[PDB]
Amino acid sequence: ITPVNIEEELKSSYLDYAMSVIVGRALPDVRDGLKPVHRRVLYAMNVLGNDWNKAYKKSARVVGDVIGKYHPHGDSAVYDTIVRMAQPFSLRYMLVDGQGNFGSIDGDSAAAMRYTEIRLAKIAHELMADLEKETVDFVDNYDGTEKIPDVMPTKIPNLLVNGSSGIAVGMATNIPPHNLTEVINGCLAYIDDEDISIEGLMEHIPGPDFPTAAIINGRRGIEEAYRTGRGKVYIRARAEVEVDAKTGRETIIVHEIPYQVNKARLIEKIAELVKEKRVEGISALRDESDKDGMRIVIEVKRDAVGEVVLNNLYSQTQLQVSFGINMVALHHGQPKIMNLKDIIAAFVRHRREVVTRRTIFELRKARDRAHILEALAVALANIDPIIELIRHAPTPAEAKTALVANPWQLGNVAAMLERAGDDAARPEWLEPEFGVRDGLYYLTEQQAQAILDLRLQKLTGLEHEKLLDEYKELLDQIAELLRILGSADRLMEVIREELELVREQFGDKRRTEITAN
Amino acid sequence: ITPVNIEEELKSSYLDYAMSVIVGRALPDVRDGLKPVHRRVLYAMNVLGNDWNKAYKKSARVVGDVIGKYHPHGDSAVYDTIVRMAQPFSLRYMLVDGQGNFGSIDGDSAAAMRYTEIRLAKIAHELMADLEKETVDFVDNYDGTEKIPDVMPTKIPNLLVNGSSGIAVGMATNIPPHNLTEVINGCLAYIDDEDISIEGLMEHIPGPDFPTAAIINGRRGIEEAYRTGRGKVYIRARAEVEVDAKTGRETIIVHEIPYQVNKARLIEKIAELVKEKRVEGISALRDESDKDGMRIVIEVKRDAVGEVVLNNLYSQTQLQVSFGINMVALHHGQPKIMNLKDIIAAFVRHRREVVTRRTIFELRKARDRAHILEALAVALANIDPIIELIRHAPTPAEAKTALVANPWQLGNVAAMLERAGDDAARPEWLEPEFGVRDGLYYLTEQQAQAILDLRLQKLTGLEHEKLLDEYKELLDQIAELLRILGSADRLMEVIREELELVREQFGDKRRTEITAN
Amino acid sequence: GKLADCQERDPALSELYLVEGDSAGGSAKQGRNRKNQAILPLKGKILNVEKARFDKMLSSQEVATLITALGCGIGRDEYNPDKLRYHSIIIMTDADVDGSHIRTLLLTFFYRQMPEIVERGHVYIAQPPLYKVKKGKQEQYIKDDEAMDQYQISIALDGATLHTNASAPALAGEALEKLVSEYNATQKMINRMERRYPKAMLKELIYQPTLTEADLSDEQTVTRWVNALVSELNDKEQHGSQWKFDVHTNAEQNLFEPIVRVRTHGVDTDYPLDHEFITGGEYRRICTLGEKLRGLLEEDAFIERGERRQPVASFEQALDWLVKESRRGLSIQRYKGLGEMNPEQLWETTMDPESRRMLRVTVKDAIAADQLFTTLMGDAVEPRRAFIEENALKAANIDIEN
Amino acid sequence: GKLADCQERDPALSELYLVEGDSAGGSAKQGRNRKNQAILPLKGKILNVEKARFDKMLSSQEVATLITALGCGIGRDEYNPDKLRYHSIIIMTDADVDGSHIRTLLLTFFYRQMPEIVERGHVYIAQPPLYKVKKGKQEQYIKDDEAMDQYQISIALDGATLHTNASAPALAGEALEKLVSEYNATQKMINRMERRYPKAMLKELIYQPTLTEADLSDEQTVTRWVNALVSELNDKEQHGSQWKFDVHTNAEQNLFEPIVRVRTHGVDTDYPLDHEFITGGEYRRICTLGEKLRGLLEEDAFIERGERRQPVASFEQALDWLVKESRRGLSIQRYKGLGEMNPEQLWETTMDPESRRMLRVTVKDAIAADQLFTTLMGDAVEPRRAFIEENALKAANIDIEN
DNA sequence: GATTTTATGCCTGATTCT
DNA sequence: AATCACCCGCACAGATTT
DNA sequence: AGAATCAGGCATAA
DNA sequence: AAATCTGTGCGGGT
Ligand SMILES: COc1c(NC(=O)c2ccc(NC(=O)c3ccc(NC(=O)[C@H](Cc4c[nH]nn4)NC(=O)c4ccc(NC(=O)c5ccc6cc(O)ccc6c5)cc4)cn3)c(OCCN)c2O)ccc(C(=O)O)c1O
Ligand SMILES: [Mg+2]
Ligand SMILES: [Mg+2]
């Protein structure tokens, strides 16, 4: 037993909890726009080989694997997180391909884990491109037994296109979706001119683009949010009034509703309002949405005008909603309020880093393969002494020592070996003692082992020529990679080509209409 | 709207359900005594590599794999089936080694699937012995994607050893456990003499042997059950009366209880019976069973007699129970009532079939390997012409055609082939055109391909000697397999050796005591 | 309480569905016509009223809820079929054996407790599908296995498949389809008589020439015939079994029988082709099919699949190659239960009035139905066991095979 | 209400526990002392009485059950602390952030509703362990990561570890342990300041000598030090890094502006070093440790490990090899929560009166505690945000350098 | 993380009719 | 087989008091 | 006094 | 008749 003051315990415990929640659960990362749970789920699904053109898997398998291996928390939260990513009316670009009962726009329910199936989406493979080439770092899991990526090498601007929403201790974040083509055009414009202002970006990006295709009523909140990071906009439904003549009847047909609205709640709220006589001029209400589109029919009395009741509905019910834009994200593990240009710059810097690391890895691999092929080509030109030496040796180890002991003359293959640009295709870790010396070749241990593994099939002419062709191809590839690493302009060309390819592949059309008051 | 008669619908539906339950759910197979769910669980656990000398795995993973791949049914039934096989007080010889909380004899219940782990037991590997050598038939699963064994190539008499219990439509089955050494001795006695009567068998198999080590009362029922296949026996608990002089007051100590009896329910029933003055002379009741063993203490009144109350306890309480032996099993896909001799004969015939198929497979493999070894030796005998011919080869196919369409000189290896004459090692599928004809070897296409896939590493002396040693031992293996297939007594000798080895490995002592009335 | 009522109040245009399982009921409630359709999920198996007492029937929860939902009376002096709600009733259970058992229990309840409901024709049975097949653009549902076989056969012979014998003939559809259908029928006939003969023996006879029992008599050609048969059997044997033949002339027509030693290490006594086998029509149809299946293929032959080609040398190989090519861009989904179906599929398959398919239950004979119910669902074990044994595999030995 | 009341009716020797979760509650009920202990499991997070109105406190089930179990009244003109039961109260929550949050909620409830109970010192806090170490025979429990690190270091240097530098010296225990402890302290000091400088520069500067500002000059002396540092950094690279340097003068001192580039086309353009850094105590202690840490190893050197000897340079890898040797026969388990522990472990580790460990809660000042509670647990967001920002990592970057 | 009563057949004990 | 009752922050109708 | 009828227990499935 | 006050729901956690 030892006394402790209440203030110190309260302070330490609450600060620890707040710091854990701020950077552990809620806020996303600016570079890839994913919370930790999303990253862990995607990595777990990728490790299983659950590709987009293969058979489905049960959700229970993936949820259990994620809980056991990487994410030690409850199963209901993980399953809800998986279910939200497969709904067409929640994400602009879905990241999971689902099968079963995943719910509907009425917000009814979703089937349990043991009644549904899932797999990765085609676009999701762009988020995890070139993951095996040491493009990012890895960190230990909760008990120092596994490795998880620190950040995905994303190729899509995920944060802007898919948006974000999160609640933390002391702060909150809320960012709407966007369109992919406009964002890519803005990124290309930024790359073309690095001192671009907000207006130049907004020429390509008028505003958000929700999945449900509502109407945005206003043009000032978008500018304020994109300039300072905080703003407010109004989303309005789509409706019209039609007259069929005859007896001068008027009916209101509702087609499209705002974002994040449950249709059944709206219908029952309107029914309750007309029951209490709070809205005058409404006779009948019906829903007739069936497999083709959304339609809600409202029949009004003959002693009223449709426009007045429509405006009353817009003012009263949930047909018009207010959306508060508030952009908060982690920059370097610290929350920060940002605007459009900061996000674009962060994405561009991430792409530069990823491409540089990929180039270094590829250069190393090419140099190693060229080093092996040099020894193979040298050995193939001195078959008779090599086979004589191997036959006379009693053991493979003695044969290897005898091969390594003395130098070997280059022979007729000295033309291409000396045509290389000195140290263009020379591995760095290799000592200067080995390699092509003055008129003679010195073999290493692994080169001798590779020679001893050669098959009799390679003595044919075509197999002899293929090695030389591959050697020349590798020399060309090494030259290209060195040229890319040389200047700072080729990197932007590569990035622009990749962005244009992504735009051509995954582009789409606009849904939401922006209009003045 | 096609009408349908009620009678035909009822008849077809009920007949389909009854046949499926009879031949797919409840009754076991006589050859191995496993219901389909047990076989599927064991096969699924074996395919995953969950051996008896490796790390544990969680129950949920195995249950999910079983449900997804082979068994299209619920999870509770599968988990209960797995749990019952890991309880020392349910099976005489456990088949699953479990870690966690799998219940207790007092009446507790096992933990959920998420909190326990399992793996295979050592004895289970005897059931699946020689499964990879084409010994049993495979059948399609429910979706026609995977293969499941039709029956395990068992080596343990599982049916008699572990018993069985099942309820079907129109019939039921109930068979008690037995001791392994007695059953093996009975099988050996039957092998020695196939005309042995039931009297001869019963000298080696006195009676059942329960896990809990109760007492069996009477002897007529056992003989009747083993002669006709239906009978009844009485299982009595072990108890005694102890007095420590001094006060001269006795107490009843109970150490053991019958098979399938709950301790808590027994204690509370005894308390309820003695509360209502239904049993006289009982003063106090206590339980002190913990760690060391089982002990239940009953303190009788001072003026009572221990023997009278002890006899009344058997009549009234559950310290004595009645077990009805009723043997029903599937013989050839149909229910049938068995006795001891039929079970023993079926097991012996199954063993004979399995050994014959295994021998055939081994002989085929040995001949196939010896063919390629002869080809490689003949090729190495003439290395210089082979490489000289290959060097002038535009492509591999031309080299192969050149090698195939020409005789070759045996050289110094022919002496070894003198031991291989008489068509001992030639494959049956091989035509008479190929092979040695007049002291000059003839090569086939596959032999030429094997020659072309030869490494330089095997040009040393030791690698040459290894092939000769391998060929020499393969000739002896082929001779032994042919001699095994050539007679019937050798098969019985092999079977007897296997049975004796199993008895030595897994034998143990008796628990239950059989006594007359 | 586990009952989604319909807004329609006239008791002559409503319906009632008895779904199996809770998830299935949840899926069905979303995809239904809310005006005049009601749902009543069942959690699991239900009480058997044939064996139970009336007091326990009243005590149980599922049957009490069903009785309250129907609205009619229960027991004598209370039952009144006139005051009936939901004048249409549909079962719609799963497509496996457990579904059949629950269906039989529900039929027993309806017939024993409410005879007039069944007699007047207010009970129906639904037919949900099993397979869903998509081939890029087309999509369709297939019930059970036989329709899947027909679909596979149609897809295999769908366009191209112009078999070339010597230079470039063209069977062109109908002849090939008839030959394939006859071959499949013969294979189905052969597969159901595995107990009485080996499969390989029956398969081998089709390609060999006809025995011609009419002109055989005692020409001693049976020796060459059986020797050739045994040699052909042993030529391509790949399982270690061996075959021998025995012949005798006990009658004017010489008889023969084979003896086969198989992997079990025991030799069967014989499989004699007695007068019954040669005189049976099975051998006649086998010979008739073999007449069309002689060595029609030439030295060089191939199959002309669409924008593809591959040489072939046997009818079976050609069929296998065609079937393998037919399964290139085909996607098949198998429904393990009603819980695997989203509401749109259930609506368009089983609940749409203008595209659903059902069966109407009716009673033909009263005494026969009563005897059948008493025998099967009664609490006397021995009559049920005898009935199951009578209709067992011993009565499955149908000698027609057509 | 999930309360397993004790038998001791005298309220001067009883105990009460507030377990988190259901599995932990069941384990505690299994492993408790039945005489004078009670268990009251809590299923999940409870109401925050600081924000909620007084009406909803009575409506809430959890706090209502807790108030009933305690036995004291609630609200003014009804509270009576004399009529108390369970004079000892223990929290015993998990050892993660959610457990700390639940602990804070319970403390807020107790302090706001029952000041006298907290003042008199009847509320205690338990302390279960985190790690369990097993070494064949020696097995035990270790709490917190710092104790685990201390245990690992002690086991690494548990006898032997005679550092043979040149011919045969011997630190022999205390000197080596002191040096290792100082090195670990400097490593922690480097890690906490890792954000503002690279790791490699700090790790390499310790081996370099002092700056030697006394003989510093505008030319021929300032360049040599930075050039030597850059040379010693460049020749140890594995990630394609490059180090460059430049110097400048401001009429008082010659300041360094080193730069480094790795996997980026950009450049920081400055990592300045001037009089401010050298005047700091961090560099002073770094140089103090580096004075002992020099190239003391001769051509021959090794460590006389237990039946082992590894003559090599780069003493960091020698320490790694020592750690590997220590961990050869060591097994570690990391508890995920109270549910993992079986009843015997819970009994012997936290609930045993003679081997448990706890903490007593007391109040030092009243106004300060009240202000802290109002600031943190109130419903004013801006003060809470300001408080969290002030005590954020910026205030944690303590420049005491000691 | 924990949540209901049913079918199918052979033994028993406790209880109810003539 | 989906449902239980609380924490965290921001914006908004209808309900109470000055 | 002795037939007759009613329940609970065991192991794989909704 | 201006100004405080009381509830509901969005998305990851016990
Ligand atoms: C059968 O399925 C299959 C599979 N199967 C699988 O592949 C499968 C594989 C794996 C696992 N699992 C696991 O290995 C595991 C491992 C570890 C755990 N964790 C723990 O032990 C720890 C302990 C612990 C720590 N500290 N204290 N205790 N639990 C917890 O920390 C923990 C977390 C949360 C909670 N409560 C809540 O949140 C909660 C909520 C509401 C509340 C409401 C209230 O009002 C109040 C309170 C509420 C609280 C409490 C404690 C858990 N599981 C698995 O299980 C289910 C995965 N979902 C699998 O199914 C596959 C295929 C098929 C097929 O058909 O092909 C298939 O059918
Ligand atoms: Mg089913
Ligand atoms: Mg926790």
PDB file of N, CA and C in Angstrom, chain A residues 242-292:
ATOM      1  N   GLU A 242     -45.964  18.693 -61.347  1.00  0.00           N
ATOM      2  CA  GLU A 242     -46.493  18.376 -62.666  1.00  0.00           C
ATOM      3  C   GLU A 242     -48.011  18.488 -62.652  1.00  0.00           C
ATOM      4  N   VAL A 243     -48.564  18.897 -63.793  1.00  0.00           N
ATOM      5  CA  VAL A 243     -49.998  19.096 -63.972  1.00  0.00           C
ATOM      6  C   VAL A 243     -50.458  18.229 -65.134  1.00  0.00           C
ATOM      7  N   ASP A 244     -51.480  17.408 -64.892  1.00  0.00           N
ATOM      8  CA  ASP A 244     -52.028  16.504 -65.896  1.00  0.00           C
ATOM      9  C   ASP A 244     -53.308  17.033 -66.537  1.00  0.00           C
ATOM     10  N   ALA A 245     -53.638  18.306 -66.328  1.00  0.00           N
ATOM     11  CA  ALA A 245     -54.830  18.941 -66.910  1.00  0.00           C
ATOM     12  C   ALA A 245     -56.052  18.221 -66.340  1.00  0.00           C
ATOM     13  N   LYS A 246     -57.050  17.865 -67.154  1.00  0.00           N
ATOM     14  CA  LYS A 246     -58.265  17.204 -66.686  1.00  0.00           C
ATOM     15  C   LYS A 246     -58.975  18.060 -65.638  1.00  0.00           C
ATOM     16  N   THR A 247     -58.734  17.803 -64.347  1.00  0.00           N
ATOM     17  CA  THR A 247     -59.370  18.534 -63.257  1.00  0.00           C
ATOM     18  C   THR A 247     -58.399  19.473 -62.547  1.00  0.00           C
ATOM     19  N   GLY A 248     -57.304  19.845 -63.204  1.00  0.00           N
ATOM     20  CA  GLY A 248     -56.331  20.730 -62.581  1.00  0.00           C
ATOM     21  C   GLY A 248     -55.643  20.124 -61.379  1.00  0.00           C
ATOM     22  N   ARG A 249     -55.280  18.847 -61.462  1.00  0.00           N
ATOM     23  CA  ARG A 249     -54.608  18.178 -60.359  1.00  0.00           C
ATOM     24  C   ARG A 249     -53.134  18.557 -60.321  1.00  0.00           C
ATOM     25  N   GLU A 250     -52.574  18.560 -59.113  1.00  0.00           N
ATOM     26  CA  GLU A 250     -51.156  18.794 -58.889  1.00  0.00           C
ATOM     27  C   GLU A 250     -50.605  17.691 -58.001  1.00  0.00           C
ATOM     28  N   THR A 251     -49.449  17.154 -58.388  1.00  0.00           N
ATOM     29  CA  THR A 251     -48.758  16.134 -57.616  1.00  0.00           C
ATOM     30  C   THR A 251     -47.273  16.458 -57.593  1.00  0.00           C
ATOM     31  N   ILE A 252     -46.623  16.083 -56.495  1.00  0.00           N
ATOM     32  CA  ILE A 252     -45.200  16.327 -56.280  1.00  0.00           C
ATOM     33  C   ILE A 252     -44.491  14.982 -56.345  1.00  0.00           C
ATOM     34  N   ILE A 253     -43.497  14.886 -57.226  1.00  0.00           N
ATOM     35  CA  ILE A 253     -42.715  13.673 -57.435  1.00  0.00           C
ATOM     36  C   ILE A 253     -41.299  13.953 -56.958  1.00  0.00           C
ATOM     37  N   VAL A 254     -40.854  13.202 -55.953  1.00  0.00           N
ATOM     38  CA  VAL A 254     -39.511  13.330 -55.395  1.00  0.00           C
ATOM     39  C   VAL A 254     -38.654  12.211 -55.965  1.00  0.00           C
ATOM     40  N   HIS A 255     -37.514  12.587 -56.553  1.00  0.00           N
ATOM     41  CA  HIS A 255     -36.596  11.660 -57.204  1.00  0.00           C
ATOM     42  C   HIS A 255     -35.351  11.396 -56.369  1.00  0.00           C
ATOM     43  N   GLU A 256     -34.610  12.440 -55.998  1.00  0.00           N
ATOM     44  CA  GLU A 256     -33.315  12.314 -55.341  1.00  0.00           C
ATOM     45  C   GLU A 256     -33.348  13.028 -53.999  1.00  0.00           C
ATOM     46  N   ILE A 257     -32.741  12.402 -52.992  1.00  0.00           N
ATOM     47  CA  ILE A 257     -32.743  12.903 -51.617  1.00  0.00           C
ATOM     48  C   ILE A 257     -31.332  13.356 -51.247  1.00  0.00           C
ATOM     49  N   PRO A 258     -31.140  14.073 -50.128  1.00  0.00           N
ATOM     50  CA  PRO A 258     -29.781  14.479 -49.750  1.00  0.00           C
ATOM     51  C   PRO A 258     -28.899  13.314 -49.334  1.00  0.00           C
ATOM     52  N   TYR A 259     -27.681  13.629 -48.906  1.00  0.00           N
ATOM     53  CA  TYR A 259     -26.704  12.633 -48.494  1.00  0.00           C
ATOM     54  C   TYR A 259     -26.870  12.319 -47.011  1.00  0.00           C
ATOM     55  N   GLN A 260     -26.796  11.030 -46.675  1.00  0.00           N
ATOM     56  CA  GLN A 260     -26.980  10.535 -45.307  1.00  0.00           C
ATOM     57  C   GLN A 260     -28.375  10.879 -44.777  1.00  0.00           C
ATOM     58  N   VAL A 261     -29.387  10.352 -45.466  1.00  0.00           N
ATOM     59  CA  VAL A 261     -30.782  10.476 -45.055  1.00  0.00           C
ATOM     60  C   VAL A 261     -31.459   9.129 -45.258  1.00  0.00           C
ATOM     61  N   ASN A 262     -32.206   8.679 -44.251  1.00  0.00           N
ATOM     62  CA  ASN A 262     -32.970   7.441 -44.340  1.00  0.00           C
ATOM     63  C   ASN A 262     -34.356   7.741 -44.896  1.00  0.00           C
ATOM     64  N   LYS A 263     -34.728   7.033 -45.962  1.00  0.00           N
ATOM     65  CA  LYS A 263     -35.968   7.341 -46.666  1.00  0.00           C
ATOM     66  C   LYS A 263     -37.194   7.032 -45.812  1.00  0.00           C
ATOM     67  N   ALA A 264     -37.174   5.907 -45.091  1.00  0.00           N
ATOM     68  CA  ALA A 264     -38.328   5.521 -44.284  1.00  0.00           C
ATOM     69  C   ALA A 264     -38.596   6.535 -43.181  1.00  0.00           C
ATOM     70  N   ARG A 265     -37.538   7.030 -42.534  1.00  0.00           N
ATOM     71  CA  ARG A 265     -37.719   8.047 -41.505  1.00  0.00           C
ATOM     72  C   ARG A 265     -38.321   9.317 -42.092  1.00  0.00           C
ATOM     73  N   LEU A 266     -37.874   9.714 -43.284  1.00  0.00           N
ATOM     74  CA  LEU A 266     -38.437  10.899 -43.923  1.00  0.00           C
ATOM     75  C   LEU A 266     -39.924  10.713 -44.213  1.00  0.00           C
ATOM     76  N   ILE A 267     -40.299   9.548 -44.748  1.00  0.00           N
ATOM     77  CA  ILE A 267     -41.701   9.304 -45.083  1.00  0.00           C
ATOM     78  C   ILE A 267     -42.559   9.314 -43.821  1.00  0.00           C
ATOM     79  N   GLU A 268     -42.101   8.634 -42.766  1.00  0.00           N
ATOM     80  CA  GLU A 268     -42.908   8.579 -41.552  1.00  0.00           C
ATOM     81  C   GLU A 268     -42.961   9.935 -40.856  1.00  0.00           C
ATOM     82  N   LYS A 269     -41.893  10.731 -40.945  1.00  0.00           N
ATOM     83  CA  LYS A 269     -41.930  12.077 -40.385  1.00  0.00           C
ATOM     84  C   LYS A 269     -42.936  12.950 -41.123  1.00  0.00           C
ATOM     85  N   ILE A 270     -42.983  12.849 -42.453  1.00  0.00           N
ATOM     86  CA  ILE A 270     -43.975  13.616 -43.206  1.00  0.00           C
ATOM     87  C   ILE A 270     -45.383  13.162 -42.833  1.00  0.00           C
ATOM     88  N   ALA A 271     -45.573  11.849 -42.671  1.00  0.00           N
ATOM     89  CA  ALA A 271     -46.880  11.336 -42.267  1.00  0.00           C
ATOM     90  C   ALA A 271     -47.286  11.872 -40.898  1.00  0.00           C
ATOM     91  N   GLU A 272     -46.348  11.889 -39.950  1.00  0.00           N
ATOM     92  CA  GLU A 272     -46.641  12.420 -38.622  1.00  0.00           C
ATOM     93  C   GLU A 272     -46.973  13.905 -38.686  1.00  0.00           C
ATOM     94  N   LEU A 273     -46.240  14.665 -39.503  1.00  0.00           N
ATOM     95  CA  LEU A 273     -46.497  16.097 -39.602  1.00  0.00           C
ATOM     96  C   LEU A 273     -47.881  16.370 -40.177  1.00  0.00           C
ATOM     97  N   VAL A 274     -48.254  15.665 -41.248  1.00  0.00           N
ATOM     98  CA  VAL A 274     -49.578  15.906 -41.822  1.00  0.00           C
ATOM     99  C   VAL A 274     -50.672  15.406 -40.885  1.00  0.00           C
ATOM    100  N   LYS A 275     -50.388  14.378 -40.079  1.00  0.00           N
ATOM    101  CA  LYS A 275     -51.386  13.909 -39.121  1.00  0.00           C
ATOM    102  C   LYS A 275     -51.688  14.970 -38.070  1.00  0.00           C
ATOM    103  N   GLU A 276     -50.666  15.690 -37.609  1.00  0.00           N
ATOM    104  CA  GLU A 276     -50.832  16.722 -36.592  1.00  0.00           C
ATOM    105  C   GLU A 276     -51.301  18.057 -37.164  1.00  0.00           C
ATOM    106  N   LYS A 277     -51.602  18.128 -38.462  1.00  0.00           N
ATOM    107  CA  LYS A 277     -52.082  19.343 -39.116  1.00  0.00           C
ATOM    108  C   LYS A 277     -51.053  20.469 -39.079  1.00  0.00           C
ATOM    109  N   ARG A 278     -49.767  20.135 -38.944  1.00  0.00           N
ATOM    110  CA  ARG A 278     -48.717  21.145 -38.983  1.00  0.00           C
ATOM    111  C   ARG A 278     -48.394  21.601 -40.400  1.00  0.00           C
ATOM    112  N   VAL A 279     -48.761  20.815 -41.412  1.00  0.00           N
ATOM    113  CA  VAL A 279     -48.575  21.168 -42.814  1.00  0.00           C
ATOM    114  C   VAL A 279     -49.925  21.049 -43.505  1.00  0.00           C
ATOM    115  N   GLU A 280     -50.342  22.117 -44.177  1.00  0.00           N
ATOM    116  CA  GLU A 280     -51.633  22.175 -44.846  1.00  0.00           C
ATOM    117  C   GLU A 280     -51.471  21.942 -46.342  1.00  0.00           C
ATOM    118  N   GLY A 281     -52.474  21.298 -46.931  1.00  0.00           N
ATOM    119  CA  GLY A 281     -52.529  21.091 -48.362  1.00  0.00           C
ATOM    120  C   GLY A 281     -52.047  19.746 -48.857  1.00  0.00           C
ATOM    121  N   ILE A 282     -51.739  18.806 -47.965  1.00  0.00           N
ATOM    122  CA  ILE A 282     -51.263  17.476 -48.335  1.00  0.00           C
ATOM    123  C   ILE A 282     -52.409  16.495 -48.144  1.00  0.00           C
ATOM    124  N   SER A 283     -52.780  15.800 -49.221  1.00  0.00           N
ATOM    125  CA  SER A 283     -53.888  14.849 -49.201  1.00  0.00           C
ATOM    126  C   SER A 283     -53.406  13.415 -49.017  1.00  0.00           C
ATOM    127  N   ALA A 284     -52.441  12.979 -49.828  1.00  0.00           N
ATOM    128  CA  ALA A 284     -51.998  11.589 -49.817  1.00  0.00           C
ATOM    129  C   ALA A 284     -50.500  11.510 -50.079  1.00  0.00           C
ATOM    130  N   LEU A 285     -49.899  10.422 -49.599  1.00  0.00           N
ATOM    131  CA  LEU A 285     -48.472  10.161 -49.728  1.00  0.00           C
ATOM    132  C   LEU A 285     -48.261   8.689 -50.052  1.00  0.00           C
ATOM    133  N   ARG A 286     -47.351   8.413 -50.987  1.00  0.00           N
ATOM    134  CA  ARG A 286     -47.053   7.042 -51.379  1.00  0.00           C
ATOM    135  C   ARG A 286     -45.599   6.934 -51.812  1.00  0.00           C
ATOM    136  N   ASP A 287     -45.061   5.720 -51.696  1.00  0.00           N
ATOM    137  CA  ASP A 287     -43.729   5.375 -52.176  1.00  0.00           C
ATOM    138  C   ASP A 287     -43.872   4.315 -53.257  1.00  0.00           C
ATOM    139  N   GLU A 288     -43.177   4.515 -54.382  1.00  0.00           N
ATOM    140  CA  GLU A 288     -43.307   3.643 -55.545  1.00  0.00           C
ATOM    141  C   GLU A 288     -41.951   3.337 -56.172  1.00  0.00           C
ATOM    142  N   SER A 289     -40.900   3.262 -55.361  1.00  0.00           N
ATOM    143  CA  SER A 289     -39.565   2.959 -55.863  1.00  0.00           C
ATOM    144  C   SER A 289     -39.418   1.451 -56.020  1.00  0.00           C
ATOM    145  N   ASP A 290     -39.176   0.994 -57.252  1.00  0.00           N
ATOM    146  CA  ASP A 290     -39.149  -0.444 -57.535  1.00  0.00           C
ATOM    147  C   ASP A 290     -38.171  -0.712 -58.684  1.00  0.00           C
ATOM    148  N   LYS A 291     -36.929  -1.034 -58.324  1.00  0.00           N
ATOM    149  CA  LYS A 291     -35.933  -1.679 -59.178  1.00  0.00           C
ATOM    150  C   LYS A 291     -35.415  -0.803 -60.318  1.00  0.00           C
ATOM    151  N   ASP A 292     -35.923   0.415 -60.490  1.00  0.00           N
ATOM    152  CA  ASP A 292     -35.532   1.310 -61.578  1.00  0.00           C
ATOM    153  C   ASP A 292     -35.079   2.670 -61.075  1.00  0.00           C
TER     154      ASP A 292
END
